[PDB]
Structure formats: C-alpha cells, structure tokens
Design an enzyme around this catalytic site. Sequence first.
Site, mmCIF file in Angstrom:
data_model
loop_
_atom_site.group_PDB
_atom_site.id
_atom_site.type_symbol
_atom_site.label_atom_id
_atom_site.label_comp_id
_atom_site.label_asym_id
_atom_site.label_seq_id
_atom_site.Cartn_x
_atom_site.Cartn_y
_atom_site.Cartn_z
ATOM 1 N N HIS A 9 0.815 -1.211 0.000
ATOM 2 C CA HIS A 9 0.000 0.000 0.000
ATOM 3 C C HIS A 9 0.852 1.266 0.000
ATOM 4 C CE1 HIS A 9 0.166 -0.130 4.591
ATOM 5 N NE2 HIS A 9 0.184 1.181 4.407
ATOM 6 N N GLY A 26 2.727 6.558 8.890
ATOM 7 C CA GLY A 26 4.003 6.639 8.230
ATOM 8 C C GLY A 26 5.003 5.618 8.701
ATOM 9 N N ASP A 32 -0.076 -7.644 1.429
ATOM 10 C CA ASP A 32 0.313 -6.241 1.475
ATOM 11 C C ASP A 32 1.821 -6.101 1.596
ATOM 12 O OD1 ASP A 32 0.057 -3.478 1.435
ATOM 13 O OD2 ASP A 32 -0.417 -3.335 3.596
HETATM 14 C C1 O31 Z 1 -7.921 2.466 9.581
HETATM 15 C C2 O31 Z 1 -6.402 2.384 9.280
HETATM 16 C C3 O31 Z 1 -5.631 2.583 10.605
HETATM 17 C C4 O31 Z 1 -6.000 3.528 8.312
HETATM 18 C C5 O31 Z 1 -6.168 1.010 8.631
HETATM 19 N N1 O31 Z 1 -6.493 -0.032 9.542
HETATM 20 C C6 O31 Z 1 -7.012 -1.283 9.020
HETATM 21 O O1 O31 Z 1 -7.303 -1.456 7.861
HETATM 22 O O2 O31 Z 1 -7.164 -2.282 10.006
HETATM 23 C C7 O31 Z 1 -7.695 -3.505 9.579
HETATM 24 C C8 O31 Z 1 -8.222 -4.173 10.815
HETATM 25 C C9 O31 Z 1 -7.033 -4.891 11.424
HETATM 26 C C10 O31 Z 1 -6.092 -5.234 10.255
HETATM 27 C C11 O31 Z 1 -6.641 -4.444 9.046
HETATM 28 O O3 O31 Z 1 -7.194 -5.316 8.125
HETATM 29 C C12 O31 Z 1 -7.264 -4.794 6.805
HETATM 30 C C13 O31 Z 1 -5.851 -4.835 6.163
HETATM 31 C C14 O31 Z 1 -5.323 -3.702 5.707
HETATM 32 C C15 O31 Z 1 -3.936 -3.702 5.072
HETATM 33 F F1 O31 Z 1 -3.064 -2.952 5.815
HETATM 34 F F2 O31 Z 1 -3.414 -4.947 4.972
HETATM 35 C C16 O31 Z 1 -3.956 -3.079 3.684
HETATM 36 N N2 O31 Z 1 -3.615 -3.873 2.542
HETATM 37 C C17 O31 Z 1 -3.623 -3.189 1.219
HETATM 38 C C18 O31 Z 1 -3.278 -3.976 0.086
HETATM 39 C C19 O31 Z 1 -3.276 -3.346 -1.151
HETATM 40 C C20 O31 Z 1 -3.612 -1.989 -1.290
HETATM 41 C C21 O31 Z 1 -3.952 -1.203 -0.180
HETATM 42 C C22 O31 Z 1 -3.956 -1.833 1.076
HETATM 43 N N3 O31 Z 1 -4.311 -0.991 2.264
HETATM 44 C C23 O31 Z 1 -4.293 -1.647 3.523
HETATM 45 O O4 O31 Z 1 -4.650 -0.940 4.676
HETATM 46 C C24 O31 Z 1 -4.608 0.475 4.531
HETATM 47 C C25 O31 Z 1 -3.230 1.006 4.804
HETATM 48 C C26 O31 Z 1 -3.054 0.732 6.227
HETATM 49 C C27 O31 Z 1 -2.274 1.758 7.019
HETATM 50 O O5 O31 Z 1 -2.639 2.898 7.180
HETATM 51 N N4 O31 Z 1 -1.027 1.263 7.547
HETATM 52 C C28 O31 Z 1 -0.188 2.075 8.428
HETATM 53 C C29 O31 Z 1 0.664 3.199 7.942
HETATM 54 O O6 O31 Z 1 1.418 3.839 8.619
HETATM 55 N N5 O31 Z 1 0.514 3.403 6.549
HETATM 56 S S1 O31 Z 1 1.435 4.642 5.972
HETATM 57 O O7 O31 Z 1 2.864 4.488 6.151
HETATM 58 O O8 O31 Z 1 0.966 5.907 6.604
HETATM 59 C C30 O31 Z 1 1.038 4.816 4.209
HETATM 60 C C31 O31 Z 1 -0.442 4.998 3.840
HETATM 61 C C32 O31 Z 1 2.097 5.584 3.392
HETATM 62 C C33 O31 Z 1 1.942 4.076 3.222
HETATM 63 C C34 O31 Z 1 0.350 1.299 9.631
HETATM 64 C C35 O31 Z 1 -0.847 2.238 9.803
HETATM 65 C C36 O31 Z 1 -0.588 3.509 10.647
HETATM 66 F F3 O31 Z 1 -1.353 4.529 10.201
HETATM 67 F F4 O31 Z 1 -0.954 3.156 11.921
HETATM 68 N N6 O31 Z 1 -4.430 0.851 6.809
HETATM 69 C C37 O31 Z 1 -5.406 1.022 5.671
HETATM 70 C C38 O31 Z 1 -4.717 0.836 8.233
HETATM 71 O O9 O31 Z 1 -3.840 0.679 9.047
#
Ligand code: O31
Length: 201
Positions: free
Chosen positions: A77, A157, A101
Amino acid sequence: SHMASMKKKGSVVIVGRINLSGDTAYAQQTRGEEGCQETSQTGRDKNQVEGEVQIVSTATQTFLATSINGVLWTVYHGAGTRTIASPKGPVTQMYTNVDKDLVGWQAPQGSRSLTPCTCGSSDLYLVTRHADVIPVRRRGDSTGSLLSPRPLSYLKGSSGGPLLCPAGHAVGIFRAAVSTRGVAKAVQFIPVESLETTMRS
Ligand SMILES: CC(C)(C)[C@@H]1NC(=O)O[C@@H]2CCC[C@H]2OC/C=C/C(F)(F)c2nc3ccccc3nc2O[C@@H]2C[C@@H](C(=O)N[C@]3(C(=O)NS(=O)(=O)C4(C)CC4)C[C@H]3C(F)F)N(C2)C1=O
Ligand SMILES: [Cl-]
Ligand SMILES: [Zn+2]
C-alpha cells in the site's frame, strides 16, 4: 490512449534511516525533498545506505522499509509495484504479494539485515519512523496490543517498520493499525514466518 505521453511512476527512494546502532534510537535524514524527487525520476541513488530500517518515500507517500535476510521489505500500500532507486539505477521488486500487502527488493549494498526471530516470545517492540520504540504484547499470529495506546497520528508513516523481540530479531513488519475513535490500541503485522514462506518458494 496517447501512449507517447503516458507517464512513468517514479522509484521508491531511501530518504533516511532509523539509527539503532547505539544506546539511543533516532531518525536521520539522508536526502531532502528536491534530491528525493530527482532520484525518484532517474532511479539513480548514489547515497551510501546504512542500517536495518530505512525511511522511504514516493512522490506522494512516506513510510518505512526493513531489511531481513538480505531483502528490503515494505508494504504494497506504500510502494505498489514500484522499483527502488539504487546506485546503478532502478531495481525491480523480487517479491510482490498484494494479498499480504507485502513487497521486497534485494537489500541495498551497505545495509544490514535483521535476523528472523526463532525465540517464540510474545514481548515485542515496534520501531516507528520517529524512532519511538513502542512495547507491544503479541496477541496472535499477526496482531499485538500497545501497552500504552496512542493516537493514530503517532503511527502514521510507520508501515514497513519492524516489530522486534527482546534479542533484537525481526518478528514482523508493521502493516495496519487497529484503531477505534482515532486511538490505536493494537497493531497488525506481517509475521516473519510469512516472509520466510514468501522467500522459500
Ligand atoms: C484504519 C487504518 C488505521 C488507516 C487502517 N487499519 C485497518 O485497515 O485495520 C484492519 C483491521 C485490522 C487489520 C486491518 O485489516 C485490513 C488490512 C489492511 C492492510 F493494511 F493490509 C492493507 N492492505 C492493502 C493492500 C493493497 C492496497 C492497499 C492496502 N491498504 C491496507 O490498509 C490500509 C493502509 C493501512 C495503514 O494505514 N497502515 C499504516 C501506515 O502507517 N501506513 S502509511 O505508512 O501511513 C502509508 C499509507 C504511506 C503508506 C500502519 C498504519 C498507521 F497509520 F498506523 N491501513 C489502511 C490501516 O492501518
Ligand atoms: Cl501475511
Ligand atoms: Zn527472537
């Protein structure tokens, strides 16, 4: 439908690291925004890479990437299918698994790799992009609870960052937060065994 003007996505670029070599964890920036933009377009990064946990960026996102077993791993992601910049040009992913992911590239020359944990311990530590070390109690194969919950902002992040055991081995890669009313009570991660399966075959 005009192929001649279709754009190309840039490379992921290493813009810094989380320094864990001494008694104090701290973030270091190794490239500013202008150089990051240039390096993303060329895919040519001549900076020397050090350490286990890199801070990486695209044109639109910033997150972490962690070396384990000679592979620099991060989240799909964040990186999508992008190349990573390197001294000799863009490097294609050697692992891509959207269902996990998960993506990985060969670890950069100069980097150090974490060792996969074989301790079977449930007392973990999450390392964030701000070099905060957050105790996490393992609660399942892919989840752990924060001993002290924090606003989601604190964790944003840090996807791609490691969860470590007490001995400093890699236990997993931070993937998603378990959040309610904007408070993250738990984290969800890619376990190192899943990486090892992705690597083995
Ligand atoms: C609500 C919430 C907290 C935003 C969200 N929670 C959430 O979905 O929880 C459910 C319930 C428990 C597990 C999870 O099951 C779903 C699986 C989600 C996934 F992760 F496998 C995922 N697979 C993807 C595959 C392909 C394309 C997009 C995908 N998008 C995904 O998820 C999305 C992304 C992930 C995210 O934000 N990750 C972090 C982060 O820092 N990103 S980042 O560096 O800023 C950035 C965006 C620059 C890259 C660590 C969390 C930080 F912010 F804490 N998400 C949403 C969340 O964490
Ligand atoms: Cl997984
Ligand atoms: Zn261990």
